[PDB]
Amino acid sequence: SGVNNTKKWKMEFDTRERWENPLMGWSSTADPLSNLVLTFSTKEDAVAFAEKNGWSFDVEERKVPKPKSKSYGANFSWNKRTRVSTK
């Protein structure tokens, strides 16, 4: 239920081939820019970094929880269906 991990703009790259080495079946890979993620305060800084570096970039808007009206008085009711059956 913690929240302070969706308060930054992180950039990450497309995942590439991940084969198993003959020795122990490790996770040897070839692309160095696989476990590379960059943080940014606002998406404008991130996109500016992306274009100036020259990487083809994709944009996803910051999804945030809609604030819902919550009241403990809804747990009980005279006619509404919202009355709870156990606590």
């Binding site: 009711s77 006619n79 269906r81 009355r83 059956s85």
Partner: protein, 45 residues
């Protein structure tokens, strides 16, 4: 006439059956009133 200050008359509670509660609750049901309606018959409906 003489009020006896050292006697107990709450004795009928001694000879009470295991259903005595509901035995006269059912009779008391006649002297009642329509219960108010909440609309839906169940909170799950």
């Amino acid at each position: 006439e003489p009020f006896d200050n050292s006697t107990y008359r709450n004795l009928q509670h001694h000879e009470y059956s295991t259903y005595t509660f509901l035995d006269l609750n059912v009779e008391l049901s006649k002297f009642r009133m329509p219960q108010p309606s909440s609309g839906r018959q169940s909170p799950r409906h």
